[PDB]
PDB file of C-alpha atoms in Angstrom:
ATOM      1  CA  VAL A   1     194.709 136.693 140.038  1.00  0.00           C
ATOM      2  CA  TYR A   2     191.688 134.795 138.532  1.00  0.00           C
ATOM      3  CA  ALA A   3     192.719 131.752 140.710  1.00  0.00           C
ATOM      4  CA  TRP A   4     194.697 133.288 143.642  1.00  0.00           C
ATOM      5  CA  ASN A   5     196.636 131.047 146.102  1.00  0.00           C
ATOM      6  CA  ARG A   6     195.717 130.717 149.845  1.00  0.00           C
ATOM      7  CA  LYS A   7     198.084 130.139 152.848  1.00  0.00           C
ATOM      8  CA  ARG A   8     196.647 129.395 156.389  1.00  0.00           C
ATOM      9  CA  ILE A   9     197.996 130.825 159.689  1.00  0.00           C
ATOM     10  CA  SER A  10     196.545 129.356 162.964  1.00  0.00           C
ATOM     11  CA  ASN A  11     197.374 128.564 166.659  1.00  0.00           C
ATOM     12  CA  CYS A  12     200.094 131.284 167.121  1.00  0.00           C
ATOM     13  CA  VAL A  13     200.866 134.940 168.188  1.00  0.00           C
ATOM     14  CA  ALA A  14     202.347 137.852 166.132  1.00  0.00           C
ATOM     15  CA  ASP A  15     203.496 141.460 165.702  1.00  0.00           C
ATOM     16  CA  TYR A  16     201.571 142.924 162.718  1.00  0.00           C
ATOM     17  CA  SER A  17     203.117 146.452 162.895  1.00  0.00           C
ATOM     18  CA  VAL A  18     206.019 145.190 160.701  1.00  0.00           C
ATOM     19  CA  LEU A  19     203.519 145.157 157.743  1.00  0.00           C
ATOM     20  CA  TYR A  20     203.785 149.015 157.583  1.00  0.00           C
ATOM     21  CA  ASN A  21     206.979 149.698 159.639  1.00  0.00           C
ATOM     22  CA  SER A  22     209.019 147.524 157.166  1.00  0.00           C
ATOM     23  CA  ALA A  23     210.503 149.349 154.128  1.00  0.00           C
ATOM     24  CA  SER A  24     209.578 146.193 152.050  1.00  0.00           C
ATOM     25  CA  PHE A  25     205.883 147.201 151.543  1.00  0.00           C
ATOM     26  CA  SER A  26     204.987 150.024 149.077  1.00  0.00           C
ATOM     27  CA  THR A  27     201.316 150.313 150.271  1.00  0.00           C
ATOM     28  CA  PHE A  28     199.305 149.030 153.278  1.00  0.00           C
ATOM     29  CA  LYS A  29     195.507 149.146 154.041  1.00  0.00           C
ATOM     30  CA  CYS A  30     193.088 147.576 156.580  1.00  0.00           C
ATOM     31  CA  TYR A  31     189.289 147.059 156.297  1.00  0.00           C
ATOM     32  CA  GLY A  32     187.110 146.499 159.428  1.00  0.00           C
ATOM     33  CA  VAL A  33     190.410 146.652 161.484  1.00  0.00           C
ATOM     34  CA  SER A  34     192.884 149.434 162.562  1.00  0.00           C
ATOM     35  CA  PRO A  35     196.683 149.135 161.743  1.00  0.00           C
ATOM     36  CA  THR A  36     197.778 149.586 165.422  1.00  0.00           C
ATOM     37  CA  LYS A  37     194.848 147.532 166.869  1.00  0.00           C
ATOM     38  CA  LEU A  38     196.060 144.403 164.965  1.00  0.00           C
ATOM     39  CA  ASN A  39     198.674 143.955 167.772  1.00  0.00           C
ATOM     40  CA  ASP A  40     195.833 143.734 170.418  1.00  0.00           C
ATOM     41  CA  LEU A  41     193.238 141.747 168.350  1.00  0.00           C
ATOM     42  CA  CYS A  42     192.523 138.000 167.947  1.00  0.00           C
ATOM     43  CA  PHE A  43     191.056 135.813 165.122  1.00  0.00           C
ATOM     44  CA  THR A  44     189.834 132.171 164.645  1.00  0.00           C
ATOM     45  CA  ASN A  45     192.064 131.784 161.522  1.00  0.00           C
ATOM     46  CA  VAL A  46     194.135 134.042 159.221  1.00  0.00           C
ATOM     47  CA  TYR A  47     194.117 133.318 155.447  1.00  0.00           C
ATOM     48  CA  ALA A  48     196.598 135.027 153.076  1.00  0.00           C
ATOM     49  CA  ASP A  49     195.103 135.397 149.545  1.00  0.00           C
TER      50      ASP A  49
ATOM     51  CA  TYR B   1     184.305 172.722 146.519  1.00  0.00           C
ATOM     52  CA  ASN B   2     183.715 175.729 148.881  1.00  0.00           C
ATOM     53  CA  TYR B   3     182.105 173.320 151.451  1.00  0.00           C
ATOM     54  CA  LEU B   4     184.486 171.161 153.576  1.00  0.00           C
ATOM     55  CA  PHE B   5     184.824 169.017 156.713  1.00  0.00           C
ATOM     56  CA  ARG B   6     187.792 167.866 158.868  1.00  0.00           C
ATOM     57  CA  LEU B   7     188.406 164.174 158.010  1.00  0.00           C
ATOM     58  CA  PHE B   8     191.593 163.720 160.157  1.00  0.00           C
ATOM     59  CA  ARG B   9     192.245 164.418 163.899  1.00  0.00           C
ATOM     60  CA  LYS B  10     194.221 162.779 166.804  1.00  0.00           C
ATOM     61  CA  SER B  11     191.350 163.293 169.343  1.00  0.00           C
ATOM     62  CA  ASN B  12     187.575 163.960 169.238  1.00  0.00           C
ATOM     63  CA  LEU B  13     186.214 167.519 169.795  1.00  0.00           C
ATOM     64  CA  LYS B  14     184.691 168.428 173.219  1.00  0.00           C
ATOM     65  CA  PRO B  15     181.119 169.909 173.368  1.00  0.00           C
ATOM     66  CA  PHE B  16     180.914 173.120 171.252  1.00  0.00           C
ATOM     67  CA  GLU B  17     184.720 172.976 170.558  1.00  0.00           C
ATOM     68  CA  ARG B  18     185.980 174.229 167.110  1.00  0.00           C
ATOM     69  CA  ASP B  19     189.268 173.910 165.126  1.00  0.00           C
ATOM     70  CA  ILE B  20     190.584 176.250 162.350  1.00  0.00           C
ATOM     71  CA  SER B  21     194.067 174.668 161.820  1.00  0.00           C
ATOM     72  CA  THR B  22     195.273 173.160 158.475  1.00  0.00           C
ATOM     73  CA  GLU B  23     198.246 171.331 160.161  1.00  0.00           C
ATOM     74  CA  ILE B  24     199.356 168.122 158.340  1.00  0.00           C
ATOM     75  CA  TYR B  25     198.233 164.754 159.787  1.00  0.00           C
ATOM     76  CA  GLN B  26     200.168 161.529 160.635  1.00  0.00           C
ATOM     77  CA  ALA B  27     197.893 158.466 160.027  1.00  0.00           C
ATOM     78  CA  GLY B  28     200.887 156.034 160.441  1.00  0.00           C
ATOM     79  CA  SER B  29     204.677 155.809 161.089  1.00  0.00           C
ATOM     80  CA  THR B  30     205.811 158.312 158.356  1.00  0.00           C
ATOM     81  CA  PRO B  31     208.307 160.841 159.952  1.00  0.00           C
ATOM     82  CA  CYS B  32     206.053 163.460 158.440  1.00  0.00           C
ATOM     83  CA  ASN B  33     207.487 166.910 159.469  1.00  0.00           C
ATOM     84  CA  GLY B  34     204.759 168.778 157.447  1.00  0.00           C
ATOM     85  CA  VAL B  35     205.544 166.805 154.202  1.00  0.00           C
ATOM     86  CA  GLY B  36     202.826 162.071 150.949  1.00  0.00           C
ATOM     87  CA  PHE B  37     202.034 158.701 152.628  1.00  0.00           C
ATOM     88  CA  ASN B  38     200.057 159.229 155.937  1.00  0.00           C
ATOM     89  CA  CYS B  39     200.910 163.013 155.650  1.00  0.00           C
ATOM     90  CA  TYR B  40     197.281 163.960 154.827  1.00  0.00           C
ATOM     91  CA  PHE B  41     195.885 167.512 154.682  1.00  0.00           C
ATOM     92  CA  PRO B  42     193.266 167.510 157.519  1.00  0.00           C
ATOM     93  CA  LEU B  43     190.238 168.829 155.524  1.00  0.00           C
ATOM     94  CA  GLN B  44     188.276 167.233 152.668  1.00  0.00           C
ATOM     95  CA  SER B  45     185.758 169.021 150.433  1.00  0.00           C
ATOM     96  CA  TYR B  46     182.205 167.744 149.876  1.00  0.00           C
ATOM     97  CA  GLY B  47     182.243 168.935 146.208  1.00  0.00           C
ATOM     98  CA  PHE B  48     178.375 168.887 146.093  1.00  0.00           C
TER      99      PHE B  48
END
Protein backbone atom coordinates (compact mmCIF):
# COMPACT_ATOMS: atom_id res chain seq x y z
CA VAL A 1 0.00 0.00 0.00
CA TYR A 2 3.01 2.42 0.25
CA ALA A 3 3.71 1.69 -3.49
CA TRP A 4 0.31 0.58 -4.91
CA ASN A 5 0.04 -0.91 -8.46
CA ARG A 6 -1.86 0.83 -11.35
CA LYS A 7 -3.81 -0.81 -14.26
CA ARG A 8 -5.15 1.35 -17.20
CA ILE A 9 -8.58 0.93 -18.89
CA SER A 10 -9.21 2.98 -22.12
CA ASN A 11 -11.10 2.97 -25.49
CA CYS A 12 -14.01 0.66 -24.39
CA VAL A 13 -17.59 0.46 -22.89
CA ALA A 14 -18.81 -1.22 -19.63
CA ASP A 15 -21.49 -2.14 -17.09
CA TYR A 16 -20.32 -0.85 -13.67
CA SER A 17 -23.41 -2.03 -11.68
CA VAL A 18 -21.71 -5.45 -11.23
CA LEU A 19 -19.30 -3.72 -8.74
CA TYR A 20 -22.15 -3.70 -6.13
CA ASN A 21 -24.63 -6.27 -7.61
CA SER A 22 -21.89 -8.99 -7.45
CA ALA A 23 -21.68 -10.99 -4.17
CA SER A 24 -17.81 -10.84 -4.58
CA PHE A 25 -17.46 -7.29 -3.08
CA SER A 26 -17.85 -6.77 0.72
CA THR A 27 -18.03 -2.91 0.48
CA PHE A 28 -18.52 -0.37 -2.35
CA LYS A 29 -18.27 3.50 -2.37
CA CYS A 30 -18.17 6.31 -4.99
CA TYR A 31 -16.79 9.88 -4.64
CA GLY A 32 -17.86 12.68 -7.07
CA VAL A 33 -19.97 9.97 -8.91
CA SER A 34 -23.26 8.05 -8.20
CA PRO A 35 -23.33 4.16 -8.26
CA THR A 36 -26.20 3.99 -10.84
CA LYS A 37 -24.94 7.00 -12.90
CA LEU A 38 -21.66 5.13 -13.68
CA ASN A 39 -23.63 3.22 -16.39
CA ASP A 40 -24.52 6.57 -18.16
CA LEU A 41 -21.18 8.44 -17.59
CA CYS A 42 -17.96 8.74 -19.66
CA PHE A 43 -14.24 9.32 -18.81
CA THR A 44 -10.95 10.10 -20.69
CA ASN A 45 -9.18 7.18 -18.89
CA VAL A 46 -9.88 4.82 -15.96
CA TYR A 47 -6.97 3.90 -13.62
CA ALA A 48 -7.30 1.08 -11.04
CA ASP A 49 -5.05 1.73 -7.98
CA TYR B 1 -28.89 14.50 20.08
CA ASN B 2 -32.50 15.87 20.37
CA TYR B 3 -31.95 17.84 17.08
CA LEU B 4 -32.17 15.85 13.78
CA PHE B 5 -32.59 16.08 10.00
CA ARG B 6 -33.70 13.62 7.27
CA LEU B 7 -30.53 12.52 5.41
CA PHE B 8 -32.21 9.90 3.12
CA ARG B 9 -35.21 10.20 0.71
CA LYS B 10 -36.22 8.83 -2.78
CA SER B 11 -37.58 12.24 -3.98
CA ASN B 12 -37.21 15.93 -2.99
CA LEU B 13 -39.94 17.67 -0.90
CA LYS B 14 -42.44 20.01 -2.67
CA PRO B 15 -42.88 23.63 -1.36
CA PHE B 16 -43.92 23.59 2.34
CA GLU B 17 -44.19 19.73 2.29
CA ARG B 18 -43.25 17.81 5.52
CA ASP B 19 -42.47 14.13 6.38
CA ILE B 20 -42.77 12.40 9.82
CA SER B 21 -42.00 8.77 8.74
CA THR B 22 -39.03 6.70 10.10
CA GLU B 23 -39.34 4.07 7.27
CA ILE B 24 -36.03 2.31 6.39
CA TYR B 25 -34.17 3.46 3.24
CA GLN B 26 -32.69 1.52 0.25
CA ALA B 27 -29.52 3.34 -1.02
CA GLY B 28 -28.59 0.34 -3.29
CA SER B 29 -29.64 -3.20 -4.40
CA THR B 30 -30.05 -4.74 -0.86
CA PRO B 31 -33.48 -6.58 -0.70
CA CYS B 32 -34.02 -4.54 2.42
CA ASN B 33 -37.56 -5.41 3.74
CA GLY B 34 -37.12 -3.08 6.81
CA VAL B 35 -33.77 -4.76 7.83
CA GLY B 36 -27.61 -3.27 7.49
CA PHE B 37 -25.96 -2.38 4.13
CA ASN B 38 -28.00 0.35 2.26
CA CYS B 39 -30.84 -0.24 4.85
CA TYR B 40 -30.27 3.16 6.53
CA PHE B 41 -32.55 4.77 9.14
CA PRO B 42 -33.76 7.97 7.36
CA LEU B 43 -32.86 10.54 10.08
CA GLN B 44 -29.46 11.65 11.41
CA SER B 45 -28.87 13.71 14.56
CA TYR B 46 -26.80 16.92 14.58
CA GLY B 47 -25.41 16.12 18.09
CA PHE B 48 -24.48 19.84 18.63
